């Protein structure tokens, strides 16, 4: 299957998105001390998305999951205005790794349900997705509770990853 | 309780090494070597209840051992354990190995050690005796074997 | 494409399993260091693959090498992957390796948290049991703090198989995280009442260890230790309780004063010589502490020496 590493800040929606994608169910979540791994097949293409915890204390542990990954997913809490910076420094440091030069980045702007969630364009501007070089990227405003935008993001991820029908 | 269980031949070569109390890898190897000299040099007519080694944390502990042919079985236990009870447990552990391997032999220690460990895990958990009922321990071993075979 | 996959399978057929490792070592003893270091490098390459069955095999080989004294800590993350495998047939391998390879000073203590809990929450008693025994040799105070929240629940698991294992690991939890021991102490007292004697026995082993380490918690339990001995028919268990009694009498002679009767009766009923010795040795110590002010201990001694003879 396609090896995808999905990261983000704590409480962003990584676990919720992964479990909704596999089971179609919004499950109650507790902070991920370790990690989660689930293999999801979308449009006949199987994606093994590795859910690594988003807590800062375990953010240094992100190094162990970089190898052989074919895609990066960054669950963006558009409601968390206070941590948009911390998100952008984390993203820039992650892209500084040479191990992720040929991987693909799909940006999930999560938590669109709250009234104070910023639009996806502002998410791109804050994350500097427009300034990336040699990086095939896309952004999709997503909502973990409702699931809107998840299948479009999966479609795009397959499209860049797959090579034929 | 049980600090470590070692199985090794008459040349000091390992057949099983499972520790319960934390030791460095080098310490572990050295404990084995110490134990080897402490056990393999004992005559067949020597009491199976020996003093503990020093690398394990102190001689207060005991080395309960049993051997045959070229194989030595040593149970490193602490000072509060029943040397006699242990010896009984050692023998029935062996009986379990026979029940599960249709007569365990050196080649099972050599090529099936993973299952020996599985069995051992059912016998002892974390240095504490997990099971004393020999038919039940076989039952659970086979229950796992069936699970594996099933899927 | 398809033939490249076939090539992988062909190459796989010439790859060494645990037994092949062993056989090669036996055939290359003179070049053992060369052989093994070569195999280790091959393992390093194998662990960079995406085939978990192969990687689990590589871990099996490493586990063997762990027995041989080789440092395989660099593969600990890869071992974790094996533990995170969808099949317990490989998770178990990882847990086996981890029980002898993982250390509290390594970063696996954070990395494994979710997978461990997932296996503990799994309905499969064998997956959970495997995880628990992995933890029995590899667990930290931090893992103890957070995993115990689930393990205490596991001590009420439908199957005694697990309740038993869960009880023994809680001992280690207490050793590393006594803060859980406090609320879990009465729980253990309740686990001593478990209808299934196998679980109950484990509970006895734990509480006896707790009393040994800290006698302040045995006093009010002395009546209970008495009942445990009285009701137990498991010689190993009796040994534990009786030895504990040997360790309790110095602190409370009047306990011994009452115990000496059923202990005498026990000795009369004892058929196992291994038990007999333990019984006799124990009551001798008891009689010594009781000899002051009790001029009938010599009759008890008379019995003791009849048995010693
Ligand atoms: N309002 C709203 N809440 C969401 C959405 N998606 C997830 N959440 C909530 O956000 C909280 C955190 O979600 P998690 O999935 O646990 O976050 P995480 O990224 O896995 O956090 P870590 O495990 O620490 O890395 C939970 O209470 C979720 O229910 C969303 O789209 N909208
Ligand atoms: Mg999470």
C with B: 3 or more CB pairs under 8 Å? yes
**Pairing mode, if any, of strands A71-77 and A2-7?**
parallel
Cβ–Cβ < 8 Å for C17, C61: yes
Quote the Cα angle for A100-A103-A107, to 5°.
105
Cβ–Cβ < 8 Å for A132, A94: no
Q: What is the DSSP letter of B133?
A: -
Alpha helices in C47-192, H assignment, sequence order: 52-67, 76-83, 88-101, 108-111, 113-121, 125-137, 141-154, 160-176, 178-191
Experimental determination approach used: cryo-EM
Is the CB–ligand 1 distance for residue A10 below 6 Å? Answer: yes
For C111, the closest of A3, A35, A57 (CB atoms) is: A35
* Protein residue with least CA distance to atom 21, ligand 1: A11
Q: d(Cα C180, Cα C173) in Å, to the nearest integer?
A: 7
Structure tokens at C297: 């201990």
Please count the residue pairs, one from chain B and one from chain C, whose beta carbons lie less than 8 angstroms apart: 100
C residues 273-302 near B, CB within 8 Å?
273-275, 277-278
Q: Which of C268, C278, C186 is nearest to C240 (CA)?
A: C278
Q: How close is the Cα of C91 to the center of ligand 1, in Å?
A: 28
Q: d(Cα C286, Cα C250) in Å, to the nearest integer?
A: 8
CA B124, chain centre distance (Å): 9
Structure tokens at A136: 């095939």
Q: Is A32 annotated as a binding residue?
A: no
Structure tokens at A35: 């990690």
E strand map for B20-151:
49-51, 62-68, 71-77, 124-125, 128-129
Structure tokens at C234: 């498991």
Q: Flag whether residue C143 sits within 8 Å of chain B, measured between CB atoms.
A: no
Q: What is the DSSP letter of B5?
A: E
Cβ–Cβ < 8 Å for B44, C94: no
B72 by DSSP, 3-state: which? strand
Q: d(Cα B141, Cα B118) in Å, to the nearest integer?
A: 8
Nearest CA-CA distance, residue A41 and chain C, Å: 15
Cβ–Cβ < 8 Å for C112, C118: no
Contacts of C227 (CB under 8 A, 6+ apart): none
CA distances from C301 to B130, C6, C126, C241, C283 (A): 35, 79, 50, 21, 9
C187 by DSSP, 3-state: which? helix
Q: In the complex, which subunits touch B with 3 or more CB pairs below 8 angstroms?
A: C
CA distances from C17 to A111, A134, A153, C65 (A): 48, 41, 41, 12
Nearest CA-CA distance, residue B145 and chain C, Å: 10
CA distances from A116 to A129, A134, A148, B148 (A): 21, 33, 17, 52
CA distances from B45 to B49, B63, C74 (A): 12, 16, 45
- Please list every residue in chain C whose beta carbon sits closer than 8 Å to the beta carbon of residue A28: none
In the sheet that holds B62-68, the strands lie side by side as B14-19, B2-9, B71-77, B62-68, B49-51
What is the atom index within ligand 1 of the atom nearest the CA of A29?
16
**Quick count: other Cβ atoms within 10 Å of Cβ C36?**
20
A143: left (phi over 0), alpha (psi -120 to 50) or beta: beta
Cβ–Cβ < 8 Å for B1, B129: yes
Instruction: Flag if A35 and C116 touch (Cβ within 8 Å).
Output: no
Q: Is A113 annotated as a binding residue?
A: yes
Structure tokens at B86: 């242990």
Q: How close is the Cα of C134 to the center of ligand 2, in Å?
A: 24
Quote the Cα angle for A89-A95-A96, to 5°.
90
Element containing residue C199 per DSSP (H, E): helix C197-213
Phi then psi dihedrals of residue A73, to 5 deg: -120, 125
Q: What is the DSSP letter of A68?
A: T
Instruction: Flag if C113 and A37 touch (Cβ within 8 Å).
Output: no
Q: Which of C183, C115, C114, C113 is nearest to C155 (CA)?
A: C183
Is the CB–ligand 1 distance for residue A144 below 6 Å? Answer: yes
Instruction: Flag if C50 and A34 touch (Cβ within 8 Å).
Output: no
**In the block, residue with structure tokens 């309790």:** C248
Torsion over CA: C173, C179, C181, C183 (sign) = negative
Quote the Cα angle for A149-A6-A15, to 5°.
75
**Quick count: other Cβ atoms within 10 Å of Cβ C108?**
25
Q: d(Cα C178, Cα B112) in Å, to the nearest integer?
A: 38
For A61, the closest of C48, C86, C107 (CB atoms) is: C107
Q: How close is the Cα of C96 to the center of ligand 1, in Å?
A: 34
Element containing residue C286 per DSSP (H, E): helix C273-291
End-to-end CA distance of chain C: 81
Q: How close is the Cα of C303 to the center of ligand 1, in Å?
A: 72
DSSP string, C10-53: HHHHTS--HHHHHHHHHHTSTTHHHHHHHHHHHHHHHTTSS-HH
Q: d(Cα C16, Cα C104) in Å, to the nearest integer?
A: 31
Contacts of B117 (CB under 8 A, 6+ apart): B16, B18, C96
* Protein residue with least CA distance to atom 24, ligand 1: A10
Cβ–Cβ < 8 Å for C159, C132: no
Instruction: Flag if B125 and C274 touch (Cβ within 8 Å).
Output: no
For B129, the closest of C89, C136, C205 (CB atoms) is: C205
Phi then psi dihedrals of residue B24, to 5 deg: -70, 160
For C126, the closest of B25, B29, B144 (CB atoms) is: B144
What is the atom index within ligand 1 of the atom nearest the CA of A52?
25
For B128, the closest of C100, C104, C171 (CB atoms) is: C171
Q: Is A9 annotated as a binding residue?
A: yes
Q: Which of C20, C91, C9, C15 is nearest to C46 (CA)?
A: C15
B residues 17-76 near C, CB within 8 Å?
17-20, 22, 25-26, 28-29
Phi then psi dihedrals of residue B135, to 5 deg: -85, -30
Residues with CB under 5 A from ligand 2 (ion): A 15, 32
Is the CB–ligand 1 distance for residue A29 below 6 Å? Answer: yes
Q: d(Cα A29, Cα A36) in Å, to the nearest integer?
A: 12
Is the CB–ligand 1 distance for residue A59 below 6 Å? Answer: no
Torsion over CA: A21, A23, A28, A34 (sign) = negative
Instruction: Flag if A61 and C110 touch (Cβ within 8 Å).
Output: yes
Q: d(Cα B51, Cα B58) in Å, to the nearest integer?
A: 9
DSSP string, C214-262: -GGGTGGGHHHHHHHHHH---HHHHHHHHHHHHHHTTT-HHHHHHHHHH
Breaks in chain C, after residue numbers (C to N greater than 2.5 Å): none
* Mutation choice for B interface testing from C26, C70, C126, C137 by most B CBs within 10 A: C137
Q: How close is the Cα of C118 to the center of ligand 1, in Å?
A: 19
Q: In the complex, which subunits touch C with 3 or more CB pairs below 8 angstroms?
A: A, B
**Pairing mode, if any, of strands A104-110 and A137-141?**
parallel
Q: Flag whether residue C7 sits within 8 Å of chain B, measured between CB atoms.
A: no
Instruction: Flag if B114 and C96 touch (Cβ within 8 Å).
Output: yes
Q: d(Cα B18, Cα B5) in Å, to the nearest integer?
A: 5
DSSP string, A142-156: --TTT-TTHHHHHHH
CA distances from C106 to A8, C58, C77 (A): 24, 21, 10
HSE of B98, CA atoms in CB hemisphere, 13 A: 8
Total residues found in chain A within this entry: 165
Q: d(Cα A17, Cα A51) in Å, to the nearest integer?
A: 10
Contacts of C180 (CB under 8 A, 6+ apart): C144, C145, C148, C152, C170, C173, C174
């Amino acid at each position: 299957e396609m090896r995808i590493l999905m990261v983000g800040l704590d409480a962003a929606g990584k676990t919720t998105i992964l479990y909704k994608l596999k089971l179609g169910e919004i499950v109650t979540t507790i902070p991920t001390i370790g990690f989660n791994v689930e293999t999801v097949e979308y449009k006949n293409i199987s994606f093994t998305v590795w859910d690594v915890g988003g807590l800062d204390k375990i953010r240094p542990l992100w190094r162990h999951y970089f190898q052989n990954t074919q895609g990066l997913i960054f669950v963006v809490d558009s409601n968390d205005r206070e941590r948009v910076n911390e998100a952008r420094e984390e993203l820039m440091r992650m892209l500084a790794e040479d191990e992720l030069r040929d991987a693909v980045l799909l940006v999930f702007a999560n938590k669109q349900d709250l009234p104070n969630a910023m639009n996806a364009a502002e998410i791109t501007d804050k994350l500097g997705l427009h300034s990336l070089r040699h990086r095939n990227w896309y952004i999709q405003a997503t909502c973990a509770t409702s699931g809107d935008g998840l299948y479009e993001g999966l479609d795009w991820l397959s499209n860049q990853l797959r090579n034929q029908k | 309780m049980i600090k470590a269980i070692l199985i090794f031949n008459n040349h000091g070569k390992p057949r099983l090494s499972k520790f319960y109390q934390p030791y460095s890898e080098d310490t572990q190897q050295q404990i084995i070597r110490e134990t080897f000299h402490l056990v393999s040099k004992r005559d067949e007519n020597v009491c199976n209840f020996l003093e503990g080694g020093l690398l394990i944390g102190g001689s207060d502990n005991k080395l309960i051992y049993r051997h045959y042919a070229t194989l030595y079985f040593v149970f490193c236990v602490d000072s509060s354990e029943s040397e006699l009870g242990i010896l009984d447990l050692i023998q029935v552990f062996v009986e379990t190995l026979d029940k599960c391997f249709e007569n365990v032999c050196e080649l099972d220690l050599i090529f099936h050690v993973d299952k020996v460990h599985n069995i051992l895990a059912e016998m002892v958990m974390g240095g504490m005796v997990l099971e004393t009922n020999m038919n039940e321990i076989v039952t659970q071993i086979d229950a796992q074997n069936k699970l594996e075979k099933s899927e | 494409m398809a033939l490249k996959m076939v090539k992988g399978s062909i190459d796989r057929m010439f790859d060494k399993n645990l037994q092949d490792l062993v056989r090669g070592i036996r055939n290359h003893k003179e070049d053992e260091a060369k052989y093994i270091s070569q195999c280790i490098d091959e393992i390093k390459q194998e662990l960079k693959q995406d085939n978990i069955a192969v990687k689990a095999n590589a871990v099996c080989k490493l586990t063997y090498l762990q027995m041989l004294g080789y440092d395989i800590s660099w593969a600990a993350f890869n071992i974790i992957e094996v533990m995170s495998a969808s099949k317990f047939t490989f998770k178990r391998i990882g847990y086996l390796a981890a029980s002898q390879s993982f250390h509290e000073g390594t970063d696996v203590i954070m990395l494994t948290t979710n997978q461990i809990r997932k296996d503990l929450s799994s309905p499969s008693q064998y997956d959970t049991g495997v995880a628990l025994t992995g933890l029995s040799c590899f667990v930290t105070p931090d893992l103890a703090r957070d995993l115990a929240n689930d393990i205490m629940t596991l001590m009420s698991h439908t199957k005694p198989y697990i309740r038993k294992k869960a009880v023994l690991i809680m001992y280690k939890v207490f050793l590393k995280y006594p803060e859980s021991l406090r609320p879990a102490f009465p729980r253990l007292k309740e686990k001593l009442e478990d209808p299934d004697p196998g679980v109950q026995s484990a509970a006895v082993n734990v509480i006896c260890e707790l009393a040994r380490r800290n006698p302040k918690n045995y006093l009010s339990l002395a009546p209970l230790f008495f009942k445990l001995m009285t009701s137990s028919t498991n010689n190993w268990v009796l040994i534990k309780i009786i030895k504990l009694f040997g360790a309790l009498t110095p602190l409370e002679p009047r306990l011994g004063k009452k115990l000496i009767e059923p202990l005498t009766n026990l000795i009369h009923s004892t058929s196992a010589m291994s038990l007999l010795y333990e019984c006799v040795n124990t009551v001798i110590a008891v009689l010594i502490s009781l000899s002051s002010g009790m001029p009938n201990h010599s009759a008890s001694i008379q019995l003791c020496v009849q048995k010693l003879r």
